[PDB]
Amino acid sequence: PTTENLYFQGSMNIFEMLRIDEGLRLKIYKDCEGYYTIGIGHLLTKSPDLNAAKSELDKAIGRNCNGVITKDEAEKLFNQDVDAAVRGILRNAKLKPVYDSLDAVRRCAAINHVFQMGVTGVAGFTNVLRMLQQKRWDEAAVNLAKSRWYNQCPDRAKRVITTFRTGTWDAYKNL
């Protein structure tokens, strides 16, 4: 690795990670599951009704958005969503011990996973959680690859799985 390559891990963090996995969109759109989404992976609602999505948006942003937000607003909502995922892990009796056992990079993969799936979804992966806590990285990754989360939308989840396997940022290089 060159001097530059060694600097790359200092540029990666949970925000940069999710930004890559979720993209950045300033207008309401449907995600790979067809759910109304905006900004950096902010799920507005699972309802097929666009009007409900716009309603949620104005509530989340605090103004009359008509389905459109600014980059700054996307960033604010994103920061709020990341904080929620972190708080969701730390207050959970099942997730917290696993999180604590992980290295810094895998902790990012953990926050990412909860950001995407929510606390109860992740906390339900009994086997994966045990494997991670036991440092069985290959087995954890293989089992994550069986999940509906990954299989229904592989491009959004693939880098997270790789990160759980390796504990490095390699999956986020060379976009």
mmCIF file of C-alpha atoms in Angstrom:
data_model
loop_
_atom_site.group_PDB
_atom_site.id
_atom_site.type_symbol
_atom_site.label_atom_id
_atom_site.label_comp_id
_atom_site.label_asym_id
_atom_site.label_seq_id
_atom_site.Cartn_x
_atom_site.Cartn_y
_atom_site.Cartn_z
ATOM 1 C CA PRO A 1 0.000 0.000 0.000
ATOM 2 C CA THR A 2 1.179 3.491 -0.937
ATOM 3 C CA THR A 3 1.155 6.468 1.426
ATOM 4 C CA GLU A 4 -2.150 7.413 -0.213
ATOM 5 C CA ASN A 5 -3.647 3.929 0.273
ATOM 6 C CA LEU A 6 -2.740 4.055 3.965
ATOM 7 C CA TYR A 7 -4.601 7.346 4.216
ATOM 8 C CA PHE A 8 -7.801 5.840 2.758
ATOM 9 C CA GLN A 9 -9.018 4.287 6.011
ATOM 10 C CA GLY A 10 -8.877 7.715 7.661
ATOM 11 C CA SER A 11 -11.259 9.023 5.018
ATOM 12 C CA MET A 12 -13.792 6.230 5.563
ATOM 13 C CA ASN A 13 -16.338 6.304 8.355
ATOM 14 C CA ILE A 14 -19.979 5.322 8.844
ATOM 15 C CA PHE A 15 -21.218 8.437 7.016
ATOM 16 C CA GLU A 16 -19.049 7.863 3.947
ATOM 17 C CA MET A 17 -19.963 4.162 4.059
ATOM 18 C CA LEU A 18 -23.738 4.576 4.036
ATOM 19 C CA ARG A 19 -23.403 7.416 1.532
ATOM 20 C CA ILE A 20 -21.911 4.921 -0.906
ATOM 21 C CA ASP A 21 -24.389 2.134 -0.170
ATOM 22 C CA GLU A 22 -27.495 4.364 -0.257
ATOM 23 C CA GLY A 23 -26.492 7.050 -2.741
ATOM 24 C CA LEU A 24 -27.755 10.630 -2.517
ATOM 25 C CA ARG A 25 -31.072 11.636 -4.044
ATOM 26 C CA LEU A 26 -32.749 15.010 -3.587
ATOM 27 C CA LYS A 27 -36.145 13.907 -4.915
ATOM 28 C CA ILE A 28 -38.493 11.192 -3.652
ATOM 29 C CA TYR A 29 -37.760 7.874 -5.364
ATOM 30 C CA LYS A 30 -38.511 4.159 -4.981
ATOM 31 C CA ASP A 31 -35.715 1.971 -3.619
ATOM 32 C CA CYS A 32 -34.835 -1.535 -4.835
ATOM 33 C CA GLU A 33 -37.866 -2.805 -2.900
ATOM 34 C CA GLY A 34 -40.068 -0.105 -4.426
ATOM 35 C CA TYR A 35 -40.406 1.829 -1.172
ATOM 36 C CA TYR A 36 -40.509 5.643 -1.272
ATOM 37 C CA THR A 37 -37.103 6.975 -0.209
ATOM 38 C CA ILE A 38 -35.168 10.250 -0.199
ATOM 39 C CA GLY A 39 -31.790 11.746 0.647
ATOM 40 C CA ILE A 40 -29.276 9.167 1.819
ATOM 41 C CA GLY A 41 -31.350 6.028 2.276
ATOM 42 C CA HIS A 42 -34.153 7.667 4.245
ATOM 43 C CA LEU A 43 -37.190 5.401 3.979
ATOM 44 C CA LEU A 44 -40.238 7.678 4.059
ATOM 45 C CA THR A 45 -42.931 4.998 4.186
ATOM 46 C CA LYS A 46 -43.760 1.503 2.953
ATOM 47 C CA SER A 47 -47.143 2.735 1.705
ATOM 48 C CA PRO A 48 -47.562 2.805 -2.109
ATOM 49 C CA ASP A 49 -49.246 6.198 -1.681
ATOM 50 C CA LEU A 50 -46.913 8.981 -2.829
ATOM 51 C CA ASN A 51 -49.039 11.454 -0.862
ATOM 52 C CA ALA A 52 -48.139 9.657 2.350
ATOM 53 C CA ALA A 53 -44.464 9.847 1.388
ATOM 54 C CA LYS A 54 -44.638 13.605 0.815
ATOM 55 C CA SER A 55 -46.493 13.988 4.109
ATOM 56 C CA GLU A 56 -43.718 12.153 5.965
ATOM 57 C CA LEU A 57 -41.114 14.283 4.183
ATOM 58 C CA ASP A 58 -42.561 17.653 5.201
ATOM 59 C CA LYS A 59 -42.768 16.311 8.749
ATOM 60 C CA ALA A 60 -39.177 15.066 8.751
ATOM 61 C CA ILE A 61 -37.789 18.222 7.149
ATOM 62 C CA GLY A 62 -40.128 20.740 8.760
ATOM 63 C CA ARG A 63 -41.242 22.661 5.676
ATOM 64 C CA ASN A 64 -43.366 22.321 2.543
ATOM 65 C CA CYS A 65 -40.975 20.256 0.399
ATOM 66 C CA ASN A 66 -43.251 18.986 -2.368
ATOM 67 C CA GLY A 67 -40.999 15.942 -2.698
ATOM 68 C CA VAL A 68 -37.723 17.849 -2.986
ATOM 69 C CA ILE A 69 -34.958 18.640 -0.486
ATOM 70 C CA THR A 70 -31.517 20.269 -0.468
ATOM 71 C CA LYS A 71 -28.162 18.547 0.031
ATOM 72 C CA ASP A 72 -27.840 20.183 3.455
ATOM 73 C CA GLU A 73 -31.278 18.879 4.449
ATOM 74 C CA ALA A 74 -30.380 15.401 3.208
ATOM 75 C CA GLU A 75 -27.229 15.580 5.341
ATOM 76 C CA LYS A 76 -29.161 16.599 8.455
ATOM 77 C CA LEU A 77 -31.701 13.792 8.055
ATOM 78 C CA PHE A 78 -28.875 11.365 7.373
ATOM 79 C CA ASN A 79 -27.046 12.354 10.557
ATOM 80 C CA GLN A 80 -30.296 11.884 12.493
ATOM 81 C CA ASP A 81 -30.805 8.419 10.952
ATOM 82 C CA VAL A 82 -27.233 7.348 11.739
ATOM 83 C CA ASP A 83 -27.625 8.519 15.339
ATOM 84 C CA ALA A 84 -30.880 6.561 15.616
ATOM 85 C CA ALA A 85 -29.178 3.373 14.400
ATOM 86 C CA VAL A 86 -26.312 3.814 16.882
ATOM 87 C CA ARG A 87 -28.649 4.531 19.779
ATOM 88 C CA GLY A 88 -30.772 1.554 18.712
ATOM 89 C CA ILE A 89 -27.773 -0.763 18.977
ATOM 90 C CA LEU A 90 -26.437 0.574 22.269
ATOM 91 C CA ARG A 91 -29.710 0.309 24.178
ATOM 92 C CA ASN A 92 -30.398 -3.238 22.962
ATOM 93 C CA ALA A 93 -29.370 -6.084 25.280
ATOM 94 C CA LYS A 94 -28.675 -8.453 22.369
ATOM 95 C CA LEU A 95 -26.926 -6.090 19.955
ATOM 96 C CA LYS A 96 -24.804 -4.080 22.388
ATOM 97 C CA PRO A 97 -22.559 -6.969 23.521
ATOM 98 C CA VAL A 98 -21.927 -7.939 19.888
ATOM 99 C CA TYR A 99 -21.208 -4.373 18.863
ATOM 100 C CA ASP A 100 -18.811 -3.911 21.774
ATOM 101 C CA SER A 101 -16.861 -7.038 20.767
ATOM 102 C CA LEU A 102 -16.307 -5.736 17.235
ATOM 103 C CA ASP A 103 -13.400 -3.722 15.845
ATOM 104 C CA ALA A 104 -13.997 -0.172 14.583
ATOM 105 C CA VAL A 105 -14.596 -1.101 10.946
ATOM 106 C CA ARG A 106 -17.002 -3.930 11.771
ATOM 107 C CA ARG A 107 -18.831 -1.564 14.155
ATOM 108 C CA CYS A 108 -19.494 0.614 11.102
ATOM 109 C CA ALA A 109 -20.824 -2.431 9.250
ATOM 110 C CA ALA A 110 -23.066 -3.048 12.273
ATOM 111 C CA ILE A 111 -24.465 0.490 12.306
ATOM 112 C CA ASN A 112 -24.964 0.204 8.552
ATOM 113 C CA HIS A 113 -26.837 -3.083 8.900
ATOM 114 C CA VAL A 114 -29.173 -1.622 11.566
ATOM 115 C CA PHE A 115 -29.639 1.596 9.533
ATOM 116 C CA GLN A 116 -30.814 -0.588 6.636
ATOM 117 C CA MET A 117 -32.849 -3.286 8.428
ATOM 118 C CA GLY A 118 -33.838 -1.783 11.771
ATOM 119 C CA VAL A 119 -33.094 -3.110 15.247
ATOM 120 C CA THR A 120 -35.554 -6.001 15.453
ATOM 121 C CA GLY A 121 -34.537 -7.312 12.024
ATOM 122 C CA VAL A 122 -30.858 -7.399 12.914
ATOM 123 C CA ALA A 123 -31.405 -8.620 16.483
ATOM 124 C CA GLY A 124 -33.302 -11.565 15.015
ATOM 125 C CA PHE A 125 -30.243 -12.869 13.148
ATOM 126 C CA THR A 126 -29.375 -15.142 16.084
ATOM 127 C CA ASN A 127 -26.781 -17.152 14.296
ATOM 128 C CA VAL A 128 -24.995 -14.288 12.602
ATOM 129 C CA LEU A 129 -24.749 -12.399 15.909
ATOM 130 C CA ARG A 130 -23.174 -15.421 17.615
ATOM 131 C CA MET A 131 -20.748 -15.910 14.741
ATOM 132 C CA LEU A 132 -19.652 -12.272 14.847
ATOM 133 C CA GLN A 133 -19.138 -12.384 18.596
ATOM 134 C CA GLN A 134 -17.039 -15.535 18.119
ATOM 135 C CA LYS A 135 -15.017 -13.922 15.301
ATOM 136 C CA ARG A 136 -16.245 -16.502 12.789
ATOM 137 C CA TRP A 137 -16.108 -13.947 9.995
ATOM 138 C CA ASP A 138 -16.413 -16.268 6.992
ATOM 139 C CA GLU A 139 -19.427 -18.064 8.466
ATOM 140 C CA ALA A 140 -21.070 -14.788 9.445
ATOM 141 C CA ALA A 141 -20.710 -13.478 5.895
ATOM 142 C CA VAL A 142 -22.031 -16.676 4.315
ATOM 143 C CA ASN A 143 -25.073 -16.576 6.578
ATOM 144 C CA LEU A 144 -25.719 -12.896 5.873
ATOM 145 C CA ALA A 145 -25.691 -13.871 2.189
ATOM 146 C CA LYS A 146 -28.700 -16.151 2.816
ATOM 147 C CA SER A 147 -30.859 -13.307 4.097
ATOM 148 C CA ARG A 148 -33.775 -11.673 2.327
ATOM 149 C CA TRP A 149 -32.141 -8.319 3.109
ATOM 150 C CA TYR A 150 -29.148 -9.132 0.923
ATOM 151 C CA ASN A 151 -30.873 -11.264 -1.717
ATOM 152 C CA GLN A 152 -33.725 -8.880 -2.519
ATOM 153 C CA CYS A 153 -31.304 -5.984 -2.995
ATOM 154 C CA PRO A 154 -27.741 -7.291 -3.358
ATOM 155 C CA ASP A 155 -26.065 -4.063 -4.505
ATOM 156 C CA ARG A 156 -27.093 -2.193 -1.329
ATOM 157 C CA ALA A 157 -25.916 -4.959 1.005
ATOM 158 C CA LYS A 158 -22.948 -6.572 -0.710
ATOM 159 C CA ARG A 159 -20.293 -4.171 0.608
ATOM 160 C CA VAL A 160 -21.574 -4.461 4.166
ATOM 161 C CA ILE A 161 -21.241 -8.241 4.000
ATOM 162 C CA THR A 162 -17.716 -8.013 2.623
ATOM 163 C CA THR A 163 -16.860 -5.614 5.438
ATOM 164 C CA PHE A 164 -18.105 -8.059 8.084
ATOM 165 C CA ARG A 165 -15.899 -10.683 6.446
ATOM 166 C CA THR A 166 -12.688 -8.626 6.276
ATOM 167 C CA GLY A 167 -12.928 -5.756 8.759
ATOM 168 C CA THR A 168 -11.316 -3.545 6.117
ATOM 169 C CA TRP A 169 -12.652 -0.776 3.881
ATOM 170 C CA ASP A 170 -11.649 -2.555 0.663
ATOM 171 C CA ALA A 171 -15.211 -2.943 -0.618
ATOM 172 C CA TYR A 172 -15.571 0.852 -0.717
ATOM 173 C CA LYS A 173 -12.468 1.478 -2.828
ATOM 174 C CA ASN A 174 -12.456 2.051 -6.573
ATOM 175 C CA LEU A 175 -16.103 2.966 -7.065
#
